[PDB]
């Protein structure tokens, strides 16, 4: 595992501690705690974290790599944070918010309501632009996916809710003549 | 001619506590059934009950290997047309560990009056405490 061997440089202001297999990370933006399997081990010093691999067989290699990746994302999210962006395409498609509640008018007979969970926030720069922010990769990704699943893009006009980094496969409504 | 046969109530029966943490269901079941039958004593008599009493604690932490938690099934029939019911081993371990242990132990005891008598000497608890401190049970290692 090239990933598993890489070093984690701890930024200033964030602290990492180990309670057995459990790991806790604190910093300016929040606190994370997570459990890993005991077969992998972690060293601790002032500003480097190294996860080591006792064995060279398959599952052990995969677990080494994923443990390093999870630690990296956890520390980065505590330190700088994470965000995702969403666009709305279509006539009458509108995004708004009332307090801590996102209201979407996406062509149904009723508006669609969203409330963010703890640690995650929703921001609306414009009526057709949504931003999900938080210090946890999984939760930000899950909430953005849940929002996008309300009205995914469609291939005949492009209407719907999509990421900026999406390429929609486009089709033609009438062909042959 | 001259061979020893034990009489009812003659051989003194003991109380044991066995911890079920991390042991496979079948391995523990085999040992416990052998203890209940009375096959660890030289006074074993096939038509007399000479075994001991067994308490099992932490039955919620019995082990299942492979995909037995989701793929092993227990069935019941009520004797009504179409009345078959199905239940997986893992969610019994979550909900009724005592039933799981009792079914496994019962399957490997003799099928007669004496076997039904021996089934009554087994007590199973899903937590770590039992109600039989007055019987002064003793720790037994598999």
């Amino acid at each position: 595992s090239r990933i598993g061997k890489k070093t984690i440089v701890i930024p200033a202001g964030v602290t990492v501690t180990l309670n057995g297999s459990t790991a806790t990370v604190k910093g300016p933006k929040g606190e994370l705690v997570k459990e890993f399997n005991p077969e992998i081990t972690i060293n601790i010093e002032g500003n480097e974290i190294n996860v080591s691999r006792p064995t060279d067989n398959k599952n052990h290699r995969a677990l080494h790599g994923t443990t390093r990746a999870i630690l990296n994302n956890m520390v980065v999210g505590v330190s700088e944070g994470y965000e995702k962006k969403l666009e709305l395409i279509g006539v009458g498609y509108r995004a708004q918010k009332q307090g801590d509640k996102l209201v979407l008018n996406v062509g149904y007979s009723h508006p669609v309501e969203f409330v963010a969970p703890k640690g995650v926030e929703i921001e609306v720069p414009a009526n057709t632009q949504v931003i999900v922010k938080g210090y946890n990769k999984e939760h930000v990704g899950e909430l953005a996916a849940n929002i996008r699943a309300v009205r995914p893009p469609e291939p005949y006009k492009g209407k719907g809710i999509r990421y900026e980094g999406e390429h929609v496969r486009r089709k033609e409504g009438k062909t042959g003549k | 001619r001259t061979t020893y046969m034990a009489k009812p109530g003659e051989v003194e029966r003991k109380w044991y506590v066995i911890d079920a943490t991390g042991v496979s269901l079948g391995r523990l079941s085999s040992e416990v059934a052998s203890i209940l039958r009375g096959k660890n004593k030289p006074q074993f008599t096939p038509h007399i009950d000479t075994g001991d009493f067994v308490i099992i604690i932490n039955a919620g932490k019995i082990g299942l290997t492979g995909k037995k938690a989701t793929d092993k099934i227990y069935y019941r029939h009520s004797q009504y047309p179409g009345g078959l019911k199905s239940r997986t081993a893992g969610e019994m371990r979550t909900n009724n560990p005592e039933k799981l242990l009792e079914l496994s132990i019962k399957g490997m005891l003799p099928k007669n009056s004496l076997g039904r008598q021996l089934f009554k000497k087994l007590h199973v608890y899903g937590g770590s405490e039992h109600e039989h401190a007055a019987q002064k049970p003793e720790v037994y290692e598999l």
């Binding site: - | 001259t2 061979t3 020893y4 096959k39 660890n40 004593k41 030289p42 006074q43 074993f44």
Partner: protein
Amino acid sequence: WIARINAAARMQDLSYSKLMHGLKLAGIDINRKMLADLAVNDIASFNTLADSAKKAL
């Protein structure tokens, strides 16, 4: 008889099969009936014979 001898020998850190093989190796010709009788009634002589078999192995 075999089941009773097995139970008696397991308390001496043996099996029935190992004990019987050892008693064969030592030239001892006591049959199952006498061994089980001795196990139930006179366990000290049973332990003596088990030590003899154990040394034979």
